[PDB]
Amino acid sequence: AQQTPLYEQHTLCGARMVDFHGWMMPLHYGSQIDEHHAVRTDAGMFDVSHMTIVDLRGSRTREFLRYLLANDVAKLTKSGKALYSGMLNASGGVIDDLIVYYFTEDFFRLVVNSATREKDLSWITQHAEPFGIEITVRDDLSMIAVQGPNAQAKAATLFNDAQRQAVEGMKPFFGVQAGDLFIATTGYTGEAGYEIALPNEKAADFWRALVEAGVKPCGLGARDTLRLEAGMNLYGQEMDETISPLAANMGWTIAWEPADRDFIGREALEVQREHGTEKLVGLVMTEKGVLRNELPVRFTDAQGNQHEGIITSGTFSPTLGYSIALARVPEGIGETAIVQIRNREMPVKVTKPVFVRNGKAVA
C-alpha cells in the first residue's frame, strides 16, 4: 500500500490509517462524527492527494474533450471555469466521473478518482492519441480539500497578496493557478471551500499551516457521510461500467445540446433514454438502525406486484440524525419502500437523491 507525502503529518494529527485502494489514508483522527460536524459548521480538510490529475495541451484539446466526455466542455467559456462530467464507454456505462477545468483554448485539466487511475489513464491516452494531445500525469502534485463555511476564510490566511487577488470573488466551480498553488472552488461535501494543489515537497508544510489556521483534519469516514448527504456519487457504488449515468442521477450532466456533438456513449445513451432506465433515489430510515450497501429495496405497486432495487451507498447521517441511502430502483417506485436488515423488513421513506443542501436537511 502506498502513501502520500502527508503520511507523517497525518500521524502527528492522530490519524488512524487504513489501506484505501493501495494507499494508507486516515479513516479519521479520533471521531468521524466530529469531523463531519466541523465541515458542516466551520472548516475541515482532507488529503486528496491520491486523486489523479491530468493536464492536456494542444490545439485539439477542446475538440478531444467534446468527444471524450458526456457533458460539454464548450460550456466552459471563462478562464478557469470547471464542470463535473462522466466519461462513458461505447455502451453508455460510466468509466469514471471527474472534474475538468478550462484554462486556455489549448490547456485543460482533469481530476479523476484514485481507484480508477489506471483504467482512466489508459482510456485517456488511447483516445487522445489521434488528436495529438500532450498528456501529463501530475503525480508531482498533492492536493488538499478544505471544506466548510469558514474554509475559504481560513485557507486564505495562508495566501500571499497575488493569491488573494487571484481568488477574490471566485464563484463555485472555477480553478486558478496562483504561483505554485492551484486553487479551485470545488469539493465533495456540499459546503463552500477550496481544493488546493501544490508540489509534493510543499504539501506537509501547507497542511501544518492549515491545522494552525483552525481547519480540522478529517478522514475518509467523514468524507463518505458528507458526500452521501450531499447526494454525490461514489464511483463503484452509484455507477460503474455496467450502469448508465441516467440510472445514477447523472442525467443532468449529459449535455444533449448541441445535438451534432457526438461523444463516446451518446448513441447508446440515446437508445437508453428511449428504452427507459432504473433510477437513483434517496432512502431515509427514521427508525433505529443503519442502512448498509447492497441491501435489497422492495416495494409493491398499486397492482399488488413486488419490485426490487438495491442500496448503492448507505450510511448514518450525523446532520439528519437518521440513516440515509442512495439506491438504484425500478421506475414507478412510490413514497415508501422496505429494506431487508438482518432478517427483518424495515420501512423507509423514498426521497430525492440528496439530503442536505446549502447547510440544512432538505426535508
Partner: protein, 128 residues
C-alpha cells in the same frame, strides 16, 4: 487512565466492576471503543435475561459497522444502560463511566476467577 486499576477484564475487551451489592457493571474498554469508532446506536439485552459467557447479547452500531458485544460471564442481566439510547457516544467518551452497557448478577465464581486484572489486561494490548 486507559486501563483503570480496580477493574477486572475479559477478552472480548470488556471490563467488569464489582458493585457493593455483589453484581458486576460491564462495558467495553477504551481499546474496544477506539477500534469501534463513534457509536451511533446500541441494542441492549432484556433486563431479567439469563446469559452464558460467550453469548452475543448486545450490539453496538457505529457509522461503519454493527458489532456484537459478548457476555463476559454467565449470569442474569439485572440492568442495562438506558442513557445509551440518547447518548450512545458515552461508550466512546466515557467507556469506564457513563458508557457502561449492562449489569450482571454472576452465577459462576470460577469464570470470575479467570477474568483478567488491570495487569493481565495491559499485557493483552501490549502482546499485540
Amino acid at each position: 487512565s486507559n486501563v483503570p486499576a480496580e477493574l477486572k477484564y475479559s477478552k472480548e475487551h470488556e471490563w467488569l466492576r464489582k458493585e457493593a451489592d455483589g453484581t458486576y457493571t460491564v462495558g467495553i474498554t477504551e481499546h474496544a471503543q477506539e477500534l469501534l469508532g463513534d457509536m451511533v446506536f446500541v441494542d441492549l439485552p432484556e433486563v431479567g435475561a439469563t446469559v452464558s459467557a460467550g453469548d452475543d447479547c448486545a450490539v453496538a452500531e457505529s457509522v461503519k459497522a454493527a458489532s456484537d458485544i459478548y457476555a463476559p460471564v454467565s449470569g442474569e442481566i439485572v440492568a442495562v444502560n438506558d442513557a445509551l439510547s440518547d447518548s450512545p457516544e458515552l461508550v466512546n467518551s466515557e467507556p469506564y463511566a457513563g458508557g457502561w452497557i449492562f449489569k450482571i448478577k454472576a452465577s459462576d465464581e470460577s469464570e470470575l476467577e479467570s477474568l483478567l486484572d488491570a495487569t493481565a489486561y495491559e499485557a493483552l494490548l501490549e502482546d499485540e
